[PDB]
Short mmCIF file of C-alpha atoms in Angstrom, two decimals:
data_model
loop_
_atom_site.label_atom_id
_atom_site.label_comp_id
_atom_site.label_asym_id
_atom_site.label_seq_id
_atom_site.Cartn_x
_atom_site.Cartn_y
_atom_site.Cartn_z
CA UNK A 1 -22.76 50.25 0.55
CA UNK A 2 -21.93 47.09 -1.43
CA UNK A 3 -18.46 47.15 -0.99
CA UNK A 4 -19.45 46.48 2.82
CA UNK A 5 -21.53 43.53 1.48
CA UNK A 6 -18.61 42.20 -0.16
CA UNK A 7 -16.04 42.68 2.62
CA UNK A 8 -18.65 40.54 5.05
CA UNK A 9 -18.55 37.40 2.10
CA UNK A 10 -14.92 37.67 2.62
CA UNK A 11 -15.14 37.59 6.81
CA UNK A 12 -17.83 35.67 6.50
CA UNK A 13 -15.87 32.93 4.55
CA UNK A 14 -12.72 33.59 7.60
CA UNK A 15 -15.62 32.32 9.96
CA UNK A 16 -16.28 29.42 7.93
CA UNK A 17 -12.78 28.60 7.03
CA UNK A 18 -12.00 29.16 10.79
CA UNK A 19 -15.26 26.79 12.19
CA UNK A 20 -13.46 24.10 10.43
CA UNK A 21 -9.82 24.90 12.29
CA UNK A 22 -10.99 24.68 15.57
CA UNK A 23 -13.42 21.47 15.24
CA UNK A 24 -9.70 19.97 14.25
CA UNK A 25 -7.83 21.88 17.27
CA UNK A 26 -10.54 20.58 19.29
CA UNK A 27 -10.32 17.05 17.98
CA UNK A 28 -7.11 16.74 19.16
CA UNK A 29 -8.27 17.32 23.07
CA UNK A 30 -10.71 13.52 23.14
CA UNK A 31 -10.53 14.33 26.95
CA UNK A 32 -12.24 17.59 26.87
CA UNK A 33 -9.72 19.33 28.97
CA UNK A 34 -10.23 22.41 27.14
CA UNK A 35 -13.85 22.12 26.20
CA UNK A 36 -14.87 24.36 28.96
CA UNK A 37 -13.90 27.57 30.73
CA UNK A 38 -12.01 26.81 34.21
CA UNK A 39 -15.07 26.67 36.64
CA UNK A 40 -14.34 29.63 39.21
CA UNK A 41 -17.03 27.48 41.49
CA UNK A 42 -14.21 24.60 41.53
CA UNK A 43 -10.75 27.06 40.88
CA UNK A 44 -12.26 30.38 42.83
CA UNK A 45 -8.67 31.55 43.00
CA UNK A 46 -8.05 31.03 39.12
CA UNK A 47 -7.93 34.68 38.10
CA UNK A 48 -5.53 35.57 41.01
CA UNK A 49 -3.43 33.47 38.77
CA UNK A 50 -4.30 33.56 35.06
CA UNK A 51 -5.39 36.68 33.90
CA UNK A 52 -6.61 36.63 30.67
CA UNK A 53 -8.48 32.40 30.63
CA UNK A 54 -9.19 31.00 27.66
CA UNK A 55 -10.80 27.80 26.25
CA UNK A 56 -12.79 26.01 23.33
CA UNK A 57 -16.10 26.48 24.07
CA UNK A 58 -15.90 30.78 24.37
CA UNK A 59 -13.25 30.76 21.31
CA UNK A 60 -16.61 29.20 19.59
CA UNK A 61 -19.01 31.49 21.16
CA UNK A 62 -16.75 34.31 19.25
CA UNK A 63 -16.25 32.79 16.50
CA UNK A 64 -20.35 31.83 15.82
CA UNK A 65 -20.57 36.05 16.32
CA UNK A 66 -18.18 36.82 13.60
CA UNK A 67 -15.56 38.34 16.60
CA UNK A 68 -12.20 37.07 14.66
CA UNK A 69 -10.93 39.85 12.36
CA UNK A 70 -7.90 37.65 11.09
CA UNK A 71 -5.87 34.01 11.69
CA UNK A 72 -3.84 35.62 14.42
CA UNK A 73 -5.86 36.82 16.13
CA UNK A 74 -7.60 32.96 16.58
CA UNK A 75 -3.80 31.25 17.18
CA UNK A 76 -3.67 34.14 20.19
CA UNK A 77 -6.52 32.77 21.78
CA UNK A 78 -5.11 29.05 21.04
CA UNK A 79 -2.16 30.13 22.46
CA UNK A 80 -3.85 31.25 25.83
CA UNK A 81 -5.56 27.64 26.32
CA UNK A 82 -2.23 26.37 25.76
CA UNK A 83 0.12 28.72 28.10
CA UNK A 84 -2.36 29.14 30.62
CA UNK A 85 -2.35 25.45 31.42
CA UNK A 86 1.14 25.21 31.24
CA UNK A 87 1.73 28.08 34.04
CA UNK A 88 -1.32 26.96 36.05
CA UNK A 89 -0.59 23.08 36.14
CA UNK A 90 2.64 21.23 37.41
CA UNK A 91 4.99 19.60 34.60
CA UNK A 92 4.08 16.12 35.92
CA UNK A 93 0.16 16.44 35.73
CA UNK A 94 -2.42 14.89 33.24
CA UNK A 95 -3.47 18.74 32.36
CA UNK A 96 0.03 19.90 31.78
CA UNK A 97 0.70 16.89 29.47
CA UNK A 98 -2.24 17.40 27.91
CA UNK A 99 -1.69 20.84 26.89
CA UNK A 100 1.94 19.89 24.95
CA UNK A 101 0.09 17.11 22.94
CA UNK A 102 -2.08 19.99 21.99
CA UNK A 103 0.10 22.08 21.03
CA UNK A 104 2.51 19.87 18.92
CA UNK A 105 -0.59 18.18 17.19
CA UNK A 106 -2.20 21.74 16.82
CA UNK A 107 1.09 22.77 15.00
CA UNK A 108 0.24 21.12 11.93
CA UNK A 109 -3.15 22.16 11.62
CA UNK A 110 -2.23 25.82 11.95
CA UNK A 111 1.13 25.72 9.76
CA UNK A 112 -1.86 24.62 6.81
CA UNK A 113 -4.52 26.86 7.90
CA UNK A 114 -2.05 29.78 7.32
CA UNK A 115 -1.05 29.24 3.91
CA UNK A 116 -4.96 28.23 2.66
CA UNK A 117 -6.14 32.07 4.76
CA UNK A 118 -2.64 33.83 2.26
CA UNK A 119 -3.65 31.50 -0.52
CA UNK A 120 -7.58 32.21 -0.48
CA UNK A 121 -6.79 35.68 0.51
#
């Protein structure tokens, strides 16, 4: 149908509108923290304790195939980079530091994103 072509022009402009979120999310980690998965190589017992990992660079990979249906569903998966850390690492560590300056800075940038996604529909 048609009405399928115009319901992909309005994901399609979610995944546009949503690129530019994260390339700001992601602006606010300069030390790459959260660039990358957790290497299993380096962390092989990461799973035992985070079960669901998260991180920039497969947020992206989703994101580049269309795989975000809405804005919450892309703050859950924020979320996860964020909570993971903060259960994974110590209070007084560099990563666990990191992840509340991510998280207070990311704030902003979501608490616009919501009302231009309500706003452009």
């Amino acid at each position: 149908s048609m009405e399928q072509v115009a319901m992909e022009l309005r994901l399609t402009e979610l995944t546009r509108l949503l690129r530019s979120v994260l390339d700001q999310l992601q602006d606010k980690d300069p030390a790459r923290i959260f660039a990358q998965p957790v290497s299993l190589k380096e962390v092989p017992d990461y799973l035992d304790h985070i079960k669901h990992p998260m991180d920039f660079a497969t947020m992206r990979k989703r994101l580049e195939a269309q795989g975000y249906k809405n804005l919450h569903e892309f703050e859950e998966d924020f979320d996860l980079i964020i909570d993971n850390c903060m259960k994974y690492n110590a209070r007084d560590t560099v990563f666990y530091r990191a992840a509340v300056r991510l998280r207070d800075q990311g704030g902003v940038v979501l608490r616009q994103a919501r009302r231009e996604v309500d706003s452009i529909g």
